Amino acid sequence: TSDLIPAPPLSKVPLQQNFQDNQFQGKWYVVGLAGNAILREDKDPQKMYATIYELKEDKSYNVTSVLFRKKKCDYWIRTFVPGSQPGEFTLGNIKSYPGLTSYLVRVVSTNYNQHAMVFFKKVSQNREYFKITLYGRTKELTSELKENFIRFSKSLGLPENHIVFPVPIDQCID
Ligand SMILES: O=C(N[C@@H](CO)C(=O)O)c1cccc(O)c1O
Ligand SMILES: O=C(O)c1cccc(O)c1O
Ligand SMILES: O=C(O)c1cccc(O)c1O
Numbered sequence: 001t002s003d004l005i006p007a008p009p010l011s012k013v014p015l016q017q018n019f020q021d022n023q024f025q026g027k028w029y030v031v032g033l034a035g036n037a038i039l040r041e042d043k044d045p046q047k048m049y050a051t052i053y054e055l056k057e058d059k060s061y062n063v064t065s066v067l068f069r070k071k072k073c074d075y076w077i078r079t080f081v082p083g084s085q086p087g088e089f090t091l092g093n094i095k096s097y098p099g100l101t102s103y104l105v106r107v108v109s110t111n112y113n114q115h116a117m118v119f120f121k122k123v124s125q126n127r128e129y130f131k132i133t134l135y136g137r138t139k140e141l142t143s144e145l146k147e148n149f150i151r152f153s154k155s156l157g158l159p160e161n162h163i164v165f166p167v168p169i170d171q172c173i174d
């Protein structure tokens with residue numbers, strides 16, 4: 001067995017209006033992370049990592065996440081392909097990811113120069129996962145934006161223990 005909080009219907013996940021793909025480019029720090037498989041591991045807490053979005057000439061994003069683990073910097077790469085509407089994407093070259101049958105990204109909201117919330121839903125080995133990240137253009141964000149992200153995650157069925165705030169580090173994300 002594996003038990004998961006159901007994914008919310010897309011009807012409850014807002015889409016940022018007039019999404020500007022070019023302003024969304026660059027480096028974003030994950031200051032908040034919530035999902036049905038996200039768990040506040042109370043001893044060794046999650047280290048902040050970052051995600052860089054660069055618009056390709058064809059307008060798909062090359063997405064690079066960088067995290068600090070086992071004393072090195074690991075680079076996780078993937079392609080986000082414009083989906084049904086602006087601000088929505090699907091994963092490119094899905095065939096190359098074993099077990100992956102579905103992957104959707106939806107930019108919930110953002111002001112481009114400070115913060116963003118982004119929703120992800122993917123089906124892996126037939127399991128439906130979903131997560132929300134609170135991106136900060138810097139490593140810190142006000143308590144107002146953070147609780148608002150907690151509010152939004154709860155509205156999607158998540159409990160406090162499935163919501164974390166990665167502690168800021170300087171390695172690999174600076
Ligand atoms: O739950 C997710 N990931 C966790 C478990 O596979 C994790 O620990 O990264 C998850 C959910 C939706 C979309 C994703 O890219 C994703 O990594
Ligand atoms: O698998 C990862 O390391 C990862 C990192 C950042 C964002 C993601 O969705 C990931 O799956
Ligand atoms: O981004 C991916 O390609 C991916 C593949 C498998 C599992 C994941 O979480 C991913 O984010």
Ligand SMILES: [Fe+3]
């Ligand atoms: Fe992932």
